[PDB]
Each structure stands twice: as C-alpha cells, then as structure tokens.
Enzyme design. Structure first.
Site, PDB file in Angstrom:
ATOM      1  N   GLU A  31      -8.343  38.448 -28.011  1.00  0.00           N
ATOM      2  CA  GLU A  31      -7.950  39.657 -27.303  1.00  0.00           C
ATOM      3  C   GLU A  31      -8.973  39.807 -26.187  1.00  0.00           C
ATOM      4  O   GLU A  31     -10.089  40.256 -26.419  1.00  0.00           O
ATOM      5  CB  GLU A  31      -8.002  40.858 -28.260  1.00  0.00           C
ATOM      6  CG  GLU A  31      -7.487  42.142 -27.631  1.00  0.00           C
ATOM      7  CD  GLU A  31      -8.609  43.046 -27.189  1.00  0.00           C
ATOM      8  OE1 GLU A  31      -9.382  43.493 -28.060  1.00  0.00           O
ATOM      9  OE2 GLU A  31      -8.724  43.282 -25.960  1.00  0.00           O
ATOM     10  N   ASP A  83     -10.823  40.549 -32.081  1.00  0.00           N
ATOM     11  CA  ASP A  83     -10.860  41.843 -31.402  1.00  0.00           C
ATOM     12  C   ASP A  83     -11.944  41.871 -30.312  1.00  0.00           C
ATOM     13  O   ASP A  83     -13.095  41.510 -30.589  1.00  0.00           O
ATOM     14  CB  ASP A  83     -11.153  42.920 -32.455  1.00  0.00           C
ATOM     15  CG  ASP A  83     -11.162  44.301 -31.872  1.00  0.00           C
ATOM     16  OD1 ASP A  83     -12.224  44.966 -31.874  1.00  0.00           O
ATOM     17  OD2 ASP A  83     -10.081  44.714 -31.403  1.00  0.00           O
TER      18      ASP A  83
HETATM   19  O1  LIG Z   1     -12.009  47.743 -31.776  1.00  0.00           O
HETATM   20  C1  LIG Z   1     -11.835  48.455 -30.467  1.00  0.00           C
HETATM   21  C2  LIG Z   1     -10.354  48.176 -30.037  1.00  0.00           C
HETATM   22  N1  LIG Z   1     -10.225  46.729 -29.901  1.00  0.00           N
HETATM   23  C3  LIG Z   1      -8.830  46.277 -29.591  1.00  0.00           C
HETATM   24  C4  LIG Z   1      -7.854  46.810 -30.683  1.00  0.00           C
HETATM   25  O2  LIG Z   1      -6.547  46.351 -30.442  1.00  0.00           O
HETATM   26  C5  LIG Z   1      -7.884  48.365 -30.661  1.00  0.00           C
HETATM   27  O3  LIG Z   1      -6.967  48.935 -31.586  1.00  0.00           O
HETATM   28  C6  LIG Z   1      -9.322  48.809 -31.043  1.00  0.00           C
HETATM   29  O4  LIG Z   1      -9.407  50.266 -31.047  1.00  0.00           O
END
Ligand SMILES: OC[C@H]1NC[C@H](O)[C@@H](O)[C@@H]1O
Length: 558
Positions: A253, A199
């Site tokens: 991500e 993440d």
């Molecule tokens: O953790 C912050 C943010 N990172 C990316 C995640 O996909 C999203 O759902 C989340 O709110």
C-alpha cells in the site's frame, strides 16, 4: 511475462468488523467469514485479503496493534483463524493478511516499555525527541489531525505518530526492531498464510534529523513521508530475510508515493514486493492538500491515469486494480451513478472494467451487490477517526463551514465502505442477531445478497459471470492494454491483446445513447458478454450502438 497465481487471481477484500457477526455482539468475526466461504466460492473468488485481525484497542479499527501474536478478541480465537486457513485451503482459496508494521498501538508492550523511561531497553523502538523552543520537534502534521508529535510529560519528550496519537511509529533504523518484526512475520507465515498486504509500506524510513517541511511540502506531506533514505534497503532486507523464503504474494500500500517512484517497490528484479496498490486512480478527484475535499473529474482523466499506471508497471512490475476499499467511498457511488435508475447498470459497467484490467483485481466486500455510500447527515454519525481529525483541523478552527465540509465528507468518508454487509432483507440485513457496531444502510431492503444470488440478472451474478470469463481467457489477465482514445470523455474503450487473441472492452459512461465507431478497421467477431443492452451485435460489426451505461466485452476479428 511470468505467470503467477497472484496475477491471475481475483481477490476479495473482507473488512472483518463489518462482514458477518456470528455471536450477536454486533461485530463481524472470523467464524462469520468461515460461514460465508461457500458464498465467496460461488462468486468465484480465488483469494481473500482480510483487514487487521490482531489484538487491538480499535482506535483505528485494527490498524493500532496491541499484540501481534494474538487474535483480536472480537474476531475470535487462534483456533478460529487456523480453521479459516483450513476451510479456505479445502476450497482452493488463499488468504492474504494485513501487515501493519509502520506503527503499533500505544498499548503494545514495546511502547509501554519505551515510554516508561529514557533508559528503557525499548526506548529506541520508537522516535523520541526534545521540544524545539518548548514546541513540537518540527511542523510535521498527522494524517489523522493535528501534529505528528505527541508530548509525554513523564520523560519530557515527544514521540512520532504519522497516524493517530495511539499509533506511535516504529523505529526501523533500529536493527532490533527489524529483527523482531521479521520474527513476527514468520509466526504468521508459518501458519500457512498465502499473502501479505503491507500497510503504508513506504513510510518505514524516517527523514534524518527530522527537519521542518517547507510550506510547499506541507501541502503534500504524505509524499514527503515516503522519501526516507533507507526505505528500499529495508523492504529488500525484509524480502531477503523473510519474503523470499515463502511462495507468497505481497502487496504494497504505497499511499503518497509519486507514481514515477512506485516501480522501485514492485519491479520483480528488485526483490522487494509483488503487487502495487497505487492510489492515483482512486484519489483522482481528491484535493491533495485538503484530503477530505472532492472535486469534479472527467473520464479522460480517469483513463489517462489508468494508462500511466499501466505503463509505469511496464514489463517488470505488476498492479492491483480496485475502485473502492475500506478507506474510500463505494465504487458505484464514486465512479458510477447510485441513483435507483442507474445503480445496477453502472455497477455492472464498473465490474466489467475492473475484471478486465492488466492487473490483479480486488473486489471489496459488498460491491459485488452494488452497495452504495451511506446517507450521513450529521457529523456525529461518523465513526472514522480520519474525518474527525479533518473536522477538528478545518471546521472547529473556523477554516471551513460545517455544511460545506459535510457535503464533501459524505462523498469521501472511509465510513461509506464500513457499514455492515447486506446479507438479506431481515433485521439489520442479516449481518447480526444483535445491534450492529455501525448502522446498516437503509437500502438493504433493496440491496442484499440473498435477493441477488438467485436472480440471473443481478449485479452479483454479473460479477460471477465476469470472474468466470476472466478465469477462462488468458488475454484478460496478461494481454497488453491499449486505450483506443485517452481523450474521449464519454466512451471508455480499450483492447486486451495476447498474440492473435484480441478483446475489446467498452463502457458508455454517459446516460444517453451513444454510437461508437471502432478505429483502425477493428471489427467484432463475437460478443463475450454485455450489460444493460438489448441491441444486437453481429459478426464483423465495427460500430456499436451503446445504451446509457452499457458495457461489454467483445472478441475482435483477426
Ligand atoms: O494504518 C494507517 C492506515 N493505513 C492504510 C489503511 O488502509 C488505513 O485503514 C489505516 O487507517
């Protein structure tokens, strides 16, 4: 070209909270996932990526972790989790979990200690700074609204939170933090997890001295937060001390990272991560400054981004490909046409292009059924903290009128993908025996899994056919990707080639019949699959008559 199970796999993303509830509390759980593994195996899924499953107060539905070593109460027990791993292994399926280590919950033990006093051993596990002239340390904005700095009156200092105030950022510059995080990763990896999705992986490294962002930088602060001077040093260190000791797939991500810089995270020679989650495509029609606002887009822009993303991965990197997920609107609504007359054909067309990209495809729960955006009317119908933050920053301040704002967030909100999975036509679509935590889309009576699994022409069975085709044809995974005309706004056509094995993929994005003559003396040997078309294609044809939203995969001569 080095073959890997994770390049060839078709991943399915399960958002636990909204997949399947088995205890009647309205919240999806691990036993619900287990109950549906045969469904996913029938679909043809090779790996499942689950969103956060750890103990959390759920300010951000799991992304605010209170205890990294405990299962979220609503999701079940550690035994349930081990059983999921076991039941998946028996079906030759691999599990990828979500790793959220840019920040923790403000209820996490480390933060509870950190905030208690300036001399606490854990003070440096987070970022604490004095006010600048009685104001926040700098002008950093939060992704979820307002300032990224939260004042704590007890110690008279502010702590950093790129996301919610309940999501304080961890200080990766502190070796003790990194060591504790690596130990935590091992705890999960030793349980047999096959993959990790990191993440907001590009924001671990903060900017030295926290200087103010310029007016320009403020218009795309997300990109500024990915420019930490030690990010690759940290991701590579994590690879050396943890990742390289397991045969796992790691996805990154990298929201906010300019495409040109993405390769540093995924080039196999760099020993960092494996699979790139770029967002250039999925956010092509989004305003980069007012991140809730959408704008018109054309197919040429869509395909040009895909080509750029493909070229950027090049020979040494590797991409994931997806058209929706839990942070974005449903694929059919966003890129297809969700009106009753076009939902099924356009959903099949998007399935065709998804399963034939030179990338690991990720299918988001429910999109194999053609689930659509939810018909939100008023602001109080949203659960999402992000839309609430945008509402506070833009509407409550009078910058944007409520109606224009709602017109946009109805189309862009993350909540569009978080409504309960539509299993059947029974109360609440069979998702729960109780009251769903978030309302089920009224279209569940028309769109549900039970109705589709037994219908050979369903969206579900079209995805199933495409997944088998991808599994059967190496060129559809590893073949070079060539766009036949990046400037065509009507017909998306490209080839996938591996030596003498060449396939053509075509999708008519228009709702009118289109004739499309193939370029460079290409001609068709045979149809592999097609959708929304009754037109006959024969050996050596070089011109396709395409019905509205028709899609197809063809093996080419030579
Ligand atoms: O953790 C912050 C943010 N990172 C990316 C995640 O996909 C999203 O759902 C989340 O709110």
């Amino acid at each position: 070209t080095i073959p890997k199970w994770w390049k060839e796999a078709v991943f399915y993303q399960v958002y636990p909270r909204s997949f399947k509830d088995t205890n009647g509390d309205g919240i999806g759980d691990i036993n619900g996932i287990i109950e549906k593994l045969d469904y996913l195996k029938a679909l043809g899924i090779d790996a499942i990526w689950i969103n956060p499953h750890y103990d959390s107060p759920n300010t951000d539905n799991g992304y605010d972790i209170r205890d990294y070593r405990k299962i979220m109460k609503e999701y079940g027990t550690m035994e349930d989790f081990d059983r999921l791993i076991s039941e998946m292994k028996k079906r030759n399926m691999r599990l990828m979990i979500d790793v959220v280590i840019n920040h923790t919950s403000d209820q996490n033990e480390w933060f509870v200690k950190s905030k208690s006093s300036k001399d606490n051993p854990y003070r440096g596990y987070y970022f604490w700074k004095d006010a600048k002239e009685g104001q926040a340390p700098n002008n950093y904005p939060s992704f979820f609204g307002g300032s990224a700095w939260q004042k704590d009156e007890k110690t008279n200092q502010y702590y950093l939170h790129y996301f919610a105030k309940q999501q304080p950022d961890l200080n990766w510059d502190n070796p003790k933090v990194r060591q504790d995080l690596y130990a935590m990763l091992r705890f999960w990896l030793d349980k047999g997890v096959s993959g990790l999705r990191f993440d907001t992986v590009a924001t671990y490294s903060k900017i030295p001295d926290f200087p103010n962002l310029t007016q320009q930088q403020l218009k795309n602060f997300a990109a500024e937060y990915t420019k930490g001077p030690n990010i690759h040093r940290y991701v590579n260190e994590m690879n050396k001390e943890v990742l390289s000791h397991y045969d796992i797939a790691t996805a990154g991500e990298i929201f906010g990272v300019p495409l040109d810089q993405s390769i540093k995270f995924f080039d196999r020679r760099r020993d960092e991560l494996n699979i790139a989650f770029t967002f250039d495509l999925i956010r092509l029609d989004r305003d980069s400054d007012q991140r809730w606002r959408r704008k018109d887009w054309k197919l040429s822009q869509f395909r040009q981004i895909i080509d750029n993303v493909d070229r950027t991965a090049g020979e040494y990197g590797w991409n994931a490909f997806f058209l929706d997920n839990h942070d974005n609107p449903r694929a059919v609504s966003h890129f297809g046409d969700d009106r009753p007359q076009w939902r099924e054909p356009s959903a099949k067309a998007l399935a065709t292009l998804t399963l034939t990209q030179r990338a690991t495809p990720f299918i988001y729960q429910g999109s194999e059924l053609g689930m659509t955006n939810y018909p939100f009317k008023a602001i109080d119908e949203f659960d999402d903290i992000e839309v609430k933050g945008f509402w506070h920053d833009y509407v409550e301040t009078g910058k944007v009128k409520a109606d224009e704002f709602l017109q946009n967030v109805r189309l862009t909100s993350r909540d569009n993908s978080r409504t309960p999975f539509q299993w059947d036509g029974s109360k609440n679509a069979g998702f729960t025996s109780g009251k769903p935590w978030f309302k089920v889309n009224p279209n569940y009576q028309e769109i549900n899994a039970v109705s589709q699994v037994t219908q050979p022409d369903s969206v579900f069975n079209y995805y199933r056919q495409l997944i088998k085709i991808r599994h059967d044809i190496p060129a559809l995974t590893y073949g070079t990707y060539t766009d036949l005309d990046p400037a065509n706004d009507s017909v998306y056509a490209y080839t996938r080639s591996l030596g003498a094995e060449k396939y053509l993929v075509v999708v008519n994005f228009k709702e009118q019949m289109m004739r499309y003559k193939l370029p460079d003396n290409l001609s068709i040997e045979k149809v592999i699959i097609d959708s929304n078309s009754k037109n006959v294609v024969k050996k050596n044809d070089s011109l396709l008559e395409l019905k509205p939203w028709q899609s197809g995969v063809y093996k080419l001569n030579q």
